[PDB]
Amino acid sequence: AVKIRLKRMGAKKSPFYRIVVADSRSPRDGRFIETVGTYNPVAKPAEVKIDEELALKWLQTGAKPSDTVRNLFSSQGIMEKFHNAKQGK
Template sequence: MGSKKRPFYRVVVADSRSPRDGRFIAQVGTYNPLTEPATVKLEEEEIMNWLNNGAQPSDTVKNILSKAGIMKQYHEARFSK
């Protein structure tokens, strides 16, 4: 997504065996670093569903989810048992 000198990213769920820019299962958010402050739109309920089903976020996505407070929710839900 995006164009030359205008980055725009999608946060997607993909199989680890798929190529980086290849097929993905679901789009769960977007990230636009050009706006001030950077715009992040995430579908929290869908992301929590994928994390609870065993999805492993990349380091970059983990940082985005941490800033949005989703990783904290996930850890509280997972380890509160």
């Protein structure tokens, strides 16, 4: 399905993801479903703020993260709190 994963952007010295929700198998720097987030790797270090008000609709509406998307959205209190959305199961 739509795997909400990262996407490169920035200069050639330092890449910073801005992980918008994307299709099943789109191009890397290409089409994405509905962009929500931005999280650079460096600076300083790893400071990124995500949506969580529509991103809960994205992670609950049929999706999944990548590795870095899962650690990031599990770090910002959105994967666990979404799990408390599923805790009313």
